[PDB]
Structure 1
Amino acid sequence: EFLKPRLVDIEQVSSTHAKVTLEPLERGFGHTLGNALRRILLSSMPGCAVTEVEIDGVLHEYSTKEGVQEDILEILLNLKGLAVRVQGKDEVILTLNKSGIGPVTAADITHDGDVEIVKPQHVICHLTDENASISMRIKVQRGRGYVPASTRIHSEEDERPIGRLLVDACYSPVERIAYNVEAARVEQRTDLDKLVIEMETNGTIDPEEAIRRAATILAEQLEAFVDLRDVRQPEVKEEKPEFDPILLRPVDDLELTVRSANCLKAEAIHYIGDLVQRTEVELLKTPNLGKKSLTEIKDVLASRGLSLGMRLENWPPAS
């Protein structure tokens, strides 16, 4: 036996700042949706922001480009706040190029159909010697909340590009939120209330887009709240590996020559559970393998303790 609210005037007042209002509110729900929206708006909102960056003649954050008056560590810290917005794409690599005694702003980038430089005055650095010149691959992804640089190495597995300076990721466009429910009487109703949710963007979320995807989460969360199936998990996994685990590792691990490395890409052999069972027979008949090419494979299989070509009436089991 209840009512339900909706959103009347959304009132921008700056690119950065706007008051969205919610009229049909019952007694106390004002502060209820209100606090619980501030809570889901300051955290859980979508955002894109520059993640990695390679710069021309620089190897790590702690160095000095010739002819610039910032230090690489400072230039990174200017991009952290570079406010971009992109659409269909998820990670887009913008490029920056400019020379000559002159402030390099955000506008000095190159545009993509999805790139919208929501602040083109934004200082990135200053050049300072006529033919001093910079160029960079700025990389923007889009995620949720705060992925600081550090945690972005456990996936390692060859991020070797020495040039790539990872910047701490500040993925969010809420700056600061503040609701206040002032009381609001729709002409007849004893006492219903208003809810002005004032908000502060970086410029790259349109209030309505936000306050909606905000309410959305609250639903999916409360979804599991509705009925309570006591739900649990199967568990008790397997303690019975048949083979030696070594056969579940990829052929890279063999630390082999490139012509022999791609060639096992070729004949459909990733894991060494397949190289283990393909004889010398199989190998002259494979594209580009020979005396120098296959002598190589009988020696790195020798060192790790395996051999070429055998069987296993069971490969590979079983999940």
Structure 2
Amino acid sequence: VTEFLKPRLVDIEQVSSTHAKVTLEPLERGFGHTLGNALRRILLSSMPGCAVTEVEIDGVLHEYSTKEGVQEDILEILLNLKGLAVRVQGKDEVILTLNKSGIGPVTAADITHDGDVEIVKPQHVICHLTDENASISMRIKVQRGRGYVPASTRIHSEEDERPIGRLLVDACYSPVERIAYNVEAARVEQRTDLDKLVIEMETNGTIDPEEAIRRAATILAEQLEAFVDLRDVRQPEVKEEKPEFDPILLRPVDDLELTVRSANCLKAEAIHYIGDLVQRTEVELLKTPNLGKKSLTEIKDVLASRGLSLGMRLENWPPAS
């Protein structure tokens, strides 16, 4: 009937306010798989957000070295920075400082209160600090991108030039942290099994997981707008232009599904078109020899099944032969 179905969600669990589990039911026999795959590939790669991009340290140029004042190695600090959920306004790229030392461990709330940006979890610890004379500070620089950015594409940027700013750290521009789609069987009142989608997701806290789903949906809609029927139904306008009679009149007589002898004795009377037979009565039919009950009854019953009558009055003949 060229009319599919629409799902009706029944379970939207928002446990921990950052780990969501949504359901969708029901779907078609294969829509769930493709929908889950598309949503996953969009959230993972094509999902613009914000994350840390560049780090600046005092004098530790190489990752294979250690600066006193911390009980970890620079790799641990980099891993901690990689999970710094911060969001930025319309600005494309912004730096932030952490020129702070002390005794206790350094956390995300120690960053300067830059009004243009905001940290999601200020209580997130950056690094467990040494409890004595731990004089060490750093600087971060965040941007906005498309998705996960490894260090390989930044190796070329490092090869370009080398100021003090040239450091290496990955960037998870995708605000979603993890995603998993699954398909199950759903029971319609008559249809026994259809695809029921279950999407579990977890984000960095920058946006609501349902907000991320809606953002993926609108980005997919914007991508597909170039081919969406050109309209809602593609034709909210109906007209009509047809001739007064049917093209059956132009069709030859052999399209009447009659016996071979009847067709032969009808074609012998120069009646090779239906319209040339509708506009005449059967008084002349019986005049032609070998026109008995069989042929006459067959012709009259065929034209009865066709609705037209034997013997009509029309002037438009023959258009256009």
Fold match by TM threshold 0.5: yes
| Shift, 1:211, TM fit | 1.4
Percent of pairs with identical residues: 100
Evaluate the alpha carbon distance shift between residue 157 and residue 244 of structure 1 in structure 2; reply closer, same or farther with a 3 A threshold. Answer: farther
Evaluate the alpha carbon distance shift between residue 130 and residue 301 of structure 1 in structure 2; reply closer, same or farther with a 3 A threshold. Answer: farther
Local SS of the residue matching 2:49:
strand
**In the alignment, is the contact (CA less than 8 A) between 1:18 and 1:207 conserved in 2?**
yes
Task: Mark the runs of 5 or more structure 1 residues left unpaired by the alignment.
Answer: none
Worse-superposed segment, 102-111 or 270-279:
270-279
**In the alignment, is the contact (CA less than 8 A) between 1:102 and 1:128 conserved in 2?**
yes
Worse-superposed segment, 46-55 or 257-266:
257-266
Local SS of the residue matching 1:245:
coil
* CA distance in 1: counterparts of 2:65 and 2:267, whole angstroms: 40
| Shift, 1:103, TM fit | 1.0
Evaluate the alpha carbon distance shift between residue 189 and residue 256 of structure 1 in structure 2; reply closer, same or farther with a 3 A threshold. Answer: closer
| Shift, 1:51, TM fit | 1.0
Per-residue CA distance 1:234-271 (angstroms, 9 max, x = gap) = 99999999999999999999999999999999999999
**In the alignment, is the contact (CA less than 8 A) between 1:185 and 1:193 conserved in 2?**
no
* CA distance in 1: counterparts of 2:131 and 2:90, whole angstroms: 39
Local SS of the residue matching 2:65:
coil
Evaluate the alpha carbon distance shift between residue 290 and residue 113 of structure 1 in structure 2; reply closer, same or farther with a 3 A threshold. Answer: farther
Worse-superposed segment, 2-11 or 74-83:
2-11
Per-residue CA distance 1:178-214 (angstroms, 9 max, x = gap) = 3344555688998776433221222223122221232
| Shift, 1:80, TM fit | 1.5
Q: Give 1 or 2 for the bigger CA radius of gyration.
A: 2
Evaluate the alpha carbon distance shift between residue 100 and residue 46 of structure 1 in structure 2; reply closer, same or farther with a 3 A threshold. Answer: same
Per-residue CA distance 1:12-36 (angstroms, 9 max, x = gap) = 1123310123345344423332333
* CA distance in 2: counterparts of 1:161 and 1:187, whole angstroms: 68
Evaluate the alpha carbon distance shift between residue 317 and residue 31 of structure 1 in structure 2; reply closer, same or farther with a 3 A threshold. Answer: same
Evaluate the alpha carbon distance shift between residue 191 and residue 168 of structure 1 in structure 2; reply closer, same or farther with a 3 A threshold. Answer: closer
The structure with the largest strand share of the pair is: 1
**In the alignment, is the contact (CA less than 8 A) between 1:180 and 1:197 conserved in 2?**
yes
Evaluate the alpha carbon distance shift between residue 52 and residue 239 of structure 1 in structure 2; reply closer, same or farther with a 3 A threshold. Answer: farther
**In the alignment, is the contact (CA less than 8 A) between 2:18 and 2:208 conserved in 1?**
no
* CA distance in 2: counterparts of 1:132 and 1:79, whole angstroms: 19
Local SS of the residue matching 1:219:
helix
* CA distance in 1: counterparts of 2:137 and 2:292, whole angstroms: 45
| Shift, 1:154, TM fit | 3.8
Task: Mark the runs of 5 or more structure 2 residues left unpaired by the alignment.
Answer: none
* CA distance in 2: counterparts of 1:137 and 1:81, whole angstroms: 15
| Shift, 1:315, TM fit | 75
Evaluate the alpha carbon distance shift between residue 216 and residue 64 of structure 1 in structure 2; reply closer, same or farther with a 3 A threshold. Answer: same
Local SS of the residue matching 1:161:
coil
**In the alignment, is the contact (CA less than 8 A) between 1:144 and 1:172 conserved in 2?**
yes
Per-residue CA distance 1:120-170 (angstroms, 9 max, x = gap) = 343322332533322222111121223223422545697532254231223
Worse-superposed segment, 235-244 or 145-154:
235-244
| Shift, 1:227, TM fit | 9.3
* CA distance in 2: counterparts of 1:18 and 1:237, whole angstroms: 51
Evaluate the alpha carbon distance shift between residue 95 and residue 36 of structure 1 in structure 2; reply closer, same or farther with a 3 A threshold. Answer: same
**In the alignment, is the contact (CA less than 8 A) between 1:21 and 1:197 conserved in 2?**
yes
Evaluate the alpha carbon distance shift between residue 229 and residue 235 of structure 1 in structure 2; reply closer, same or farther with a 3 A threshold. Answer: closer
| Shift, 1:228, TM fit | 14
Worse-superposed segment, 168-177 or 309-318:
309-318
| Shift, 1:289, TM fit | 118
Give 1:15's match in structure 2, choosing from 14, 17, 27.
Answer: 17
Evaluate the alpha carbon distance shift between residue 90 and residue 68 of structure 1 in structure 2; reply closer, same or farther with a 3 A threshold. Answer: same
Worse-superposed segment, 160-169 or 252-261:
252-261
Evaluate the alpha carbon distance shift between residue 75 and residue 194 of structure 1 in structure 2; reply closer, same or farther with a 3 A threshold. Answer: same
**How big is the alpha-carbon RMSD for the aligned residues of Structure 1 and Structure 2?**
29.3
Evaluate the alpha carbon distance shift between residue 64 and residue 32 of structure 1 in structure 2; reply closer, same or farther with a 3 A threshold. Answer: closer
* CA distance in 1: counterparts of 2:232 and 2:47, whole angstroms: 30
**In the alignment, is the contact (CA less than 8 A) between 1:47 and 1:172 conserved in 2?**
yes
* CA distance in 1: counterparts of 2:140 and 2:45, whole angstroms: 25
* CA distance in 1: counterparts of 2:288 and 2:167, whole angstroms: 41
Per-residue CA distance 1:267-298 (angstroms, 9 max, x = gap) = 99999999999999999999999999999999
Evaluate the alpha carbon distance shift between residue 27 and residue 290 of structure 1 in structure 2; reply closer, same or farther with a 3 A threshold. Answer: closer
Worse-superposed segment, 187-196 or 270-279:
270-279
Evaluate the alpha carbon distance shift between residue 312 and residue 102 of structure 1 in structure 2; reply closer, same or farther with a 3 A threshold. Answer: farther
| Shift, 1:72, TM fit | 2.8
**In the alignment, is the contact (CA less than 8 A) between 2:19 and 2:202 conserved in 1?**
yes
Match of 1:30 in 2: 32
* CA distance in 2: counterparts of 1:157 and 1:252, whole angstroms: 83
| Shift, 1:52, TM fit | 0.7
